[PDB]
Design a binder for this molecule. Structure first.
Ligand SMILES: O=C(O)C1(c2ccc(Cl)cc2)CCCC1
Ligand SMILES: O=C(O)C1(c2ccc(Cl)cc2)CCCC1
Lengths: 200, 207
């Protein structure tokens, strides 16, 4: 009653086959592989949903048909946010980034992507869930990337809480440290690496 | 028992007043509701332009949203707003809409200034206040289409063969809008509206 709709992992999994509404409407995006065109130009909206059951029907459909889709990059964002760092809701933000080197494609990509999506749709970060914009998976030859995008890179308490809960939900050992990068820093190419604003 | 609020009570909760002590000072609604908007942005596709603005489940959260949109109102031709029960998309193909229809009010260009704002608010108050007794369960939502030629307001219901529910909703809605008995509102099946067969859609009921 003014209260946030929060779902844990077990509940979301028990809904996998009256619909259960989500706090937010979400949009799944894909980028086509056409290198004669810009990323903006290759952006496609796949579908929008705001129920747990519509989430699973979409996830199940993509998971079976993705080997046949022309490209390698998916994004899940809150309704009204484009998965581009120049969006008003992204320009001051950044991302918690998980890098998965080669072996971890076979073993970890599918499980890490799903656990990410469940954190988003289930509002797993308490009031700091409002700082979340979306998540992005980049499927590459050299190694995959999964990231949660947030709206304000100077909100250290929101960003650090998101980071801590995300790492815990991924099951990562405290030994494997994850970094938060400002989109403004990621945009500038200064060598092989981009500065971390925060680490957990 | 169903949480039912009349117009005077909902109007009394508007515009501030009191601290939400114990998180128990807000008046709960029977249903959670979602406000949707359609943008007339031709640089984007229509799936991209249909947006969920906010969800609410108390009277006071309703007014804070309504006041915010009313202040910020573009009111642009081609734009829709819709208020639907949580879990129903404002599209006739939704499982809760496909067998249904709508009670439709059409307003001419000059009625945009006189009647649009009042008719939209009275519609929203009927929805959130559960004004149709047990038949309020048949309501899905309401839609306002703002157009150059003339505006449309409609209450959407879930089942066009529930004659008694549909006729009760129609009767009460016309009364709450303050319309003269001479101005007749029609109920159209979404299945009939979808098919373009000439000059008009069949009304299956009138009040
Ligand atoms: O297995 C798939 O196809 C992946 C995917 C699943 C579901 C959704 Cl919704 C999007 C993408 C796994 C990670 C990227 C590709
Ligand atoms: O004054 C506004 O902008 C209108 C509106 C008010 C409140 C809400 Cl919640 C939605 C839309 C009045 C009719 C449609 C536009």
């Amino acid at each position: 009653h003014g209260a946030r709709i929060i779902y844990d992992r077990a509940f979301l999994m028990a809904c996998r086959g009256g619909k259960h509404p989500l706090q937010n409407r979400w949009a799944l995006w894909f980028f086509k592989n056409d290198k004669s065109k810009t990323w903006q130009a290759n952006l496609r909206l796949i579908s929008k949903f705001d129920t747990v059951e519509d989430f699973w029907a979409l996830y199940n459909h993509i998971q079976l048909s993705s080997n046949l889709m022309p490209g390698c990059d998916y994004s899940l964002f809150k309704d009204g946010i484009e998965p581009m760092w120049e969006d008003e809701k992204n320009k001051r933000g950044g991302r918690w980034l998980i890098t998965l080197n080669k072996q971890q494609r076979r073993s970890d990509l599918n499980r890490f992507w799903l656990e990410t999506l469940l954190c988003l749709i289930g509002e797993s970060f308490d009031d700091y869930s409002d700082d979340v914009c979306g998540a992005v998976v980049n499927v590459r030859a050299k190694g995959d990337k999964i990231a949660i995008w947030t709206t304000e890179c100077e909100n250290r308490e929101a960003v650090t809480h998101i980071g801590r809960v995300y790492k815990e939900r991924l099951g990562l050992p405290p030994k494997i440290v994850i970094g938060y990068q400002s989109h403004a820093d990621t945009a500038t190419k200064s060598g092989s690496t981009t500065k971390n604003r925060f680490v957990v």
